[PDB]
Amino acid sequence: EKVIISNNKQTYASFDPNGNISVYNTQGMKIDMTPNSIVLTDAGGGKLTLQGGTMTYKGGTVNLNGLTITPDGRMTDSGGIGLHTHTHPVRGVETGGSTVTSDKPNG
Amino acid sequence: EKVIISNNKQTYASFDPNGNISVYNTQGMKIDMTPNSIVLTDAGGGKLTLQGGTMTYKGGTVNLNGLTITPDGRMTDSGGIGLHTHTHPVRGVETGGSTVTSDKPNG
Amino acid sequence: EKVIISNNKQTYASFDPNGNISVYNTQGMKIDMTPNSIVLTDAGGGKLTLQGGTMTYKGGTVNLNGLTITPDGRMTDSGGIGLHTHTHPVRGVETGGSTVTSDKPNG
Ligand SMILES: [Fe+3]
Ligand code: NA
Ligand code: NA
Ligand code: NA
Ligand code: NA
Ligand code: NA
Ligand code: NA
Ligand code: NA
Ligand code: NA
Ligand code: NA
Ligand code: NA
Ligand code: NA
Ligand code: NA
Ligand code: NA
Ligand code: NA
Ligand code: NA
Secondary structure (H helix, E strand, O other): OOEEEEEOOOEEEEEOOOOOEEEEEOOOOEEEEOOOEEEEEEOOOEEEEEEOOEEEEEOOOEEEOOEEEOOOOOEEOOOOOEOOOOOOEEEEEOEEEEEEEOOOOOO | OOEEEEEOOOEEEEEOOOOOEEEEEOOOOEEEEOOOEEEEEEOOOEEEEEEOOEEEEEOOOEEEOOEEEOOOOOEEOOOOOEOOOOOOEEEEEOEEEEEEEOOOOOO | OOEEEEEOOOEEEEEOOOOOEEEEEOOOOEEEEOOOEEEEEEOOOEEEEEEOOEEEEEOOOEEEOOEEEOOOOOEEOOOOOEOOOOOOEEEEEOEOOEEEEOOOOOO
16 A cells, blocks of 8 residues: 556656655666665665665775775775775885884874 | 645655755655755764765765775775774884884875 | 656656656756666766666765765875875884885785
8 A cells, every 4th residue: 555656667656654655667776765764776786775874885886986895895096095905115124034013004 | 835745644755946855754764855965864863965066974884885984984894904993014124123104005 | 758747847856658767956956767777966066876786976075974085086084094195103123224015904
């Protein structure tokens, strides 16, 4: 039991009597609202969810102005600097054979 | 003065004569459009805003394919590498008692 | 050929017979659905696209709980730690005149 508006059985909007609203097409793209969430569904394999005071994307590449986050959750900025791969020059040292570990970043 | 469509006083859409469109439920989830913004409101404590050629989320955890941004704006990738906490091995040095500071990342 | 709902020629929704749905105002804010995408258009110069199992924002600053990504795709956390600018202390070394390069981050 809901109200449904549809054009040619291809494009739809539905409003139910309990807090659910859905806009969708037969291809499976959807924009949903429920009592506690907003969800954008991409039929090609992505979903953006706002629920519980959190925001989640799960899918393929996220691109924010050229900064990228892979499907595996690794980040590289638009210049190619990877959070998980980057290195730093360290100047002003004596060379030798030992290894030390840096501290966390300044700031 | 606006047009309102509502099902059972639970689900709503409104269109005004000035550029404002709202889709919402009584629980307080909302999708709003104004003359200069699109806003997704999560009643559980989150908001995503597109306005002024900028995009802002303010709320709890942001999760992008397993990479996380805390409510405080600190980032950790899906492997646990924190932008603000990570360290690096530094090989090929002589040990001693001094501290140096690295340069910014290569790349 | 589509169905259009409009209030005062200022606020609009359209549903076509092929999978396209659009909600928009004369100011140029838009929420679009197509057979394979969802697009939020900010007339002030931003666009968020879900398509092909990917999510893209292209525009000005992205702010996620105080962490920022510039229009150029560089990231700084809410404490000012830049992925592309940060440095690390390196303790326990002998000073000298040489440069070494760190390894990638631990973790
Ligand atoms: Fe580093
Ligand atoms: Na990448
Ligand atoms: Na990984
Ligand atoms: Na790198
Ligand atoms: Na510490
Ligand atoms: Na800082
Ligand atoms: Na985290
Ligand atoms: Na903090
Ligand atoms: Na870390
Ligand atoms: Na520099
Ligand atoms: Na690079
Ligand atoms: Na910044
Ligand atoms: Na740049
Ligand atoms: Na920094
Ligand atoms: Na490696
Ligand atoms: Na780790």
